[PDB]
Design a protein around this ligand. Structure first.
Ligand code: CUA
Ligand code: CUA
Ligand SMILES: [Ca+2]
Ligand SMILES: [Ca+2]
Ligand SMILES: [Cl-]
Ligand SMILES: [Cl-]
Ligand code: NA
Ligand code: NA
Lengths: 588, 584
């Protein structure tokens, strides 16, 4: 299997890395593991102006005031159990958000703050018949309402919720109150069932309390029952949110119609659907096991045909110390990270099932040492029925001496492994920044991108509407619109020249600069920086971008194109003239 | 023969550090060479969610008032030198967008000082004094502005409209002096004695439009007599501008008479790169609109400033014709120069002494090879090229239009930073490295030239101001877990030790201004902790033996979780605490 990509050769797969604590999404080529692009999401990006421009701040909404995010889990939208290449979704644990990235323009186009919860951690997409819903876990138990009258996690109104977001509209679809808490989650291959692990069935806040119970559980959701209750109006709402809320808790030992609790040891973490649709596999973390939940026994479970929720467990292989995450090669093998043993263990799911029934069989096929302390891992196409068993990435937290020292902070070691054969083969150590934690791979032919924007693209439609109110045709006009203490500069740009090369304002004016890049050739990006005003953005071909700032400094202030666009780029500049406040009417 | 190994396999280590400019994204990046893998990101002018640079009190203190900016625009990373060799102490880099120079300490790989250059706009080129050591950082301000810039005068042709050459004291990171020049400044370099520096000018016309800037057949390389400048400062013969105490010297021509501080050497045309050869013989200016480089003999500059030469052009000793669009030059230490040809889209290898002899009229071919690169190269960098130890092993050419060299990724494209083996007679392209936001230029150092710390010193100046605040509250940071109440201000101090915060709950009043100071008292390498307050925009990292702090207001009543962001321990997921906010 081709391991190295030489000059002029192209990678075979796209890789989509979580930006971890840094808050972006990163696009890699696989197997070279080179970073092809960064997609700003929850971070503020100086280069493209994401978080500064009006288009990006509009998408982020009120949360545009936050400069941070914390990502764990990127996933790609699916139709009939295969990637369709339309959207990537990712979480923000720091400020409780879900973001959607449009894979044709490789930009975040929608973002939502999940109401009435704290810390969006695990995130996973419905597989069948398509990604109708984004499932997202809120990790932490909070009071409802959280008005500062009650702080007790044990109070009857303290809880966290499982969240369903409508993938196309990016509005809340529903929420399900659960017992315990939520960690990771996955979905079946029918659309009926989803499942999530829980490490805090104790509803404790201290380390000892969260580890008391021998077993926590994975909670299973009957999505069809949830929908039928919504359509029937059998739900409540919390605070000012209109989101339908359904109660998935047990009440005095009696289950709700929406959930079932399958006991699993112990503080389990990963929750992974095998690519043949057979199992929800939970990683036991503090228990040296995984637990295999038979998805085809779920209907019986929810219909009372089983006495014990443990009856849906058909395997619980002992694997090693600190199992965290599981992936699949599509050949009947699972691969599980062992955080303490610092290994990836390859095991056969059907053989593990037969061992659970008493049959003495050795389901463990190989243990590969990794470097060191692996968290999550990802096999190519593992989340689809097309899992091709070619590549595996294990994302290890302590890289130690695997890379040159770079001071007190260390990179994550994202290790590429060849699994095309019977023997796992470590081939590349990929160091990464701010603990990406997890990633997703897609074949080259599963991703179709645009090189030139469409002029009607929703990403900047609000700006077109604004321009229209000013009587502006963005494809041609170079005009300075004045409106009291607001100035709205509209210009085209075509390398190497800004369409407006100087304009004059009063000190204190609120200036919006809107630039439409009318170059028609691929890869002619322009930039726009106002010196010493903290203003910076990128404009790609046929895109419109805008940014607003206050001209609070009298005098002449240069602006320049930051992105090399032409042999005469260094000369693509302009001048803002700011008339001193003492030469104009003075206010207080 | 050029035949170095390019593969760094699992378990093997890179041979060089590479320090990449973060370009328009504003950070510094540390790569391993020859793998070309990014080992670390060092936040500088960007706001970093992961470590809290731009949010923490220690980082905002370093940034000063400019902490209000969330952007930077970087081009020119350079490493401090002693006796013309890298000494591993500091990395310096420019911010063109908000007119700054930042210093990075290479032992901790963090920005530790930052300065806004007074009375200028757009710090672009930057370069370090080489000998006897990096006393000064030299920084170009690119754009001509009025003085004062108070909005009475906007005419760039006015007698008080000009830009300035900036010298920053490298060790104190305070301004040392500024030199007013004619025209504008592009790139700059320094000699191997400490007496001379030089910079290219493209806007000798002092025009604001594209046509007017390309008006003159020749611009120039302005040469600076730094000894003369220092002598005038020492004698008090200078002025100051506005509210800056920086000594300002007038380096402009006056009615055709030269300053004592400058000489203007005519060079074609809108020249860009300005590169000192590793043998110390030449300032080499890249011709850009002229298909040439011009070679200024550093040995002739003393006679030039002494008035012993009949024409400023006499210090020009070579002007090789190389190709279309020469922008930048580097050196292998074997006598060759390597120059980017933006238009021809090549790296041309040429022999400097043979060019000098050609300029005198000898029939000799100084061009050795042209290597196609992909595509439109800007700057280039050979290993140790800025030192008298230039080792002629690796060359990076940083090309702007990657076209079809990588998988498509939407309307934006990566820069193509191509690794080239120059160890033998023939340049060999060996690796295409895609990079984000046009790093533009980079600098390499041998592994043994960089020595980093794995554990912070408790006395480190980086968080000394926080140690001081802690003193005023009576806090021993190594041990204490205490909540100090002071009006509507709450100062939480805690140790942390994987997997537990030293303070796991505290209660405040809605509207309080909360400062959380965390001291990581783990003593094992690479056990970093994080601290994130959910839904409050608060995030930071704390490495072993570091103290880090962050301030935010508790504007939301109720229970609000905080958690450790960096995987520190098998029980990392359970390392959490609770902030309880009592309603007003
Ligand atoms: Cu337009 Cu550079
Ligand atoms: Cu401490 Cu994660
Ligand atoms: Ca538990
Ligand atoms: Ca010129
Ligand atoms: Cl998972
Ligand atoms: Cl240069
Ligand atoms: Na939204
Ligand atoms: Na400073």
């Amino acid at each position: 299997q081709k391991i190295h990509v030489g000059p002029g050769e192209l990678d075979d797969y796209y890789g989509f890395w979580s930006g971890g604590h840094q808050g972006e999404v990163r696009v890699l080529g696989v197997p070279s593991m080179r970073e092809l692009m960064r997609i700003p999401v929850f971070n503020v990006d100086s280069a493209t102006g994401w978080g500064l421009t009006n288009e990006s701040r509009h998408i982020m909404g009120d949360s545009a005031k936050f400069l941070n995010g914390d990502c764990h889990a990127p996933h790609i939208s699916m139709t009939d159990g295969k990637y369709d290449g339309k959207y990537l979704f990712i979480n923000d644990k720091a400020n409780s958000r879900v973001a959607r990235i449009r894979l044709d323009i490789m930009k975040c186009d929608k973002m939502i703050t999940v109401p009435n919860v704290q810390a969006i951690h695990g995130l996973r997409l419905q597989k069948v018949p398509h990604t109708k819903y984004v499932f997202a876990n809120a990790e932490f138990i909070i009071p409802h309402p959280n008005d500062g009258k009650v702080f007790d996690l044990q109070d009857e109104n303290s809880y966290t919720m499982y969240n369903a977001i409508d993938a196309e509209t990016m509005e809340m679809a529903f929420q399900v109150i659960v017992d315990g808490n939520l960690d990771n989650t996955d979905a079946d291959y029918t659309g009926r069932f989803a499942a999530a692990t829980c490490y805090n069935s104790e509803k404790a806040f201290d380390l000892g309390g969260m580890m008391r119970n021998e077993r926590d559980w994975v909670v299973v959701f009957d999505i069809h029952a949830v929908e039928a209750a919504v359509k029937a109006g059998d739900f409540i709402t919390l605070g000012d949110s209109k989101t339908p809320v359904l109660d998935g808790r047990k009440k005095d030992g009696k289950d709700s119609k929406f959930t079932r609790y399958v006991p699993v040891p112990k503080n389990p973490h990963g929750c992974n659907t095998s690519s043949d649709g057979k199992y929800f596999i939970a990683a036991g973390k503090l228990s040296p096991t995984c637990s295999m939940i038979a998805i085809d026994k779920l209907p019986d479970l929810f219909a009372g045909k089983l006495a014990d929720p443990r009856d849906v467990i058909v395997g619980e292989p002992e694997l090693g110390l600190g199992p965290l995450h599981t992936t699949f090669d599509g050949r009947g093998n699972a691969y599980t990270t062992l955080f303490i043993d610092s290994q990836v263990v390859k095991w056969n799911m059907e053989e593990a099932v037969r061992a659970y029934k008493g049959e003495k069989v050795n389901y463990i096929k190989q243990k590969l040492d990794v470097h060191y302390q692996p968290g999550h891992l990802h096999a190519s196409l593992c989340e689809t029925n097309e899992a091709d068993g070619k590549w595996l990435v294990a994302l290890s937290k302590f890289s130690k001496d695997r890379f040159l020292p770079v001071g007190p902070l260390h990179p994550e070691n994202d290790q590429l492994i060849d699994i095309s054969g019977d023997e796992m083969k470590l081939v590349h150590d990929g160091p990464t920044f701010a603990e990406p934690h997890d990633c997703i791979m897609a074949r080259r032919d599963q991703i179709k991108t645009k090189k030139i924007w469409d002029r009607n693209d929703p990403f900047f439609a609000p700006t077109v509407e604004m321009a229209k109110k000013d009587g502006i045709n963005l494809d041609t006009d170079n005009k300075v619109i004045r409106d009291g203490n607001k100035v709205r500069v509209y210009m085209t740009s075509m390398a190497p020249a800004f369409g407006v090369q100087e304009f004059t304002v009063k000190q204190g004016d609120e200036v919006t600069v809107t630039i439409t890049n009318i170059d028609q050739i691929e890869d002619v990006s322009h930039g726009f920086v106002v010196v010493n005003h903290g203003v910076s953005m990128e404009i790609s071909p046929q895109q419109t971008s805008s940014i607003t700032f206050v001209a609070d400094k009298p005098g002449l202030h240069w602006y320049y194109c930051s992105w090399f666009c032409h042999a005469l780029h260094m000369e693509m500049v302009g001048r803002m003239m700011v008339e001193p406040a003492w030469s104009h009417p003075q206010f207080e």
